[PDB]
Amino acid sequence: HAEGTFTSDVSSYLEGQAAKEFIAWLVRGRG
Numbered sequence: 387h388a389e390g391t392f393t394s395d396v397s398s399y400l401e402g403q404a405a406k407e408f409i410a411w412l413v414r415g416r417g
């Protein structure tokens with residue numbers, strides 16, 4: 387019985403992975 391991945395990911399969600407992933411689209415083809 388062990389814990390799952392979160393202690394680390396909890397620090398990345400602050401920036402947004404999947405969501406913000408879109409920011410790359412606009413920035414890379416929107417002026």
Ligand SMILES: *C(=O)CC[C@H](NC(=O)CCCCCCCCCCCCCCC)C(=O)O
Binds near residue numbers: 404407413
């Ligand atoms: C994090 O990604 C949550 C944001 C969330 N999703 C979206 O906004 C989807 C984007 C579609 C809207 C049209 C694009 C405008 C985005 C511009 C934001 C600044 C990025 C520019 C970087 C140089 C939401 O809040 O709707």
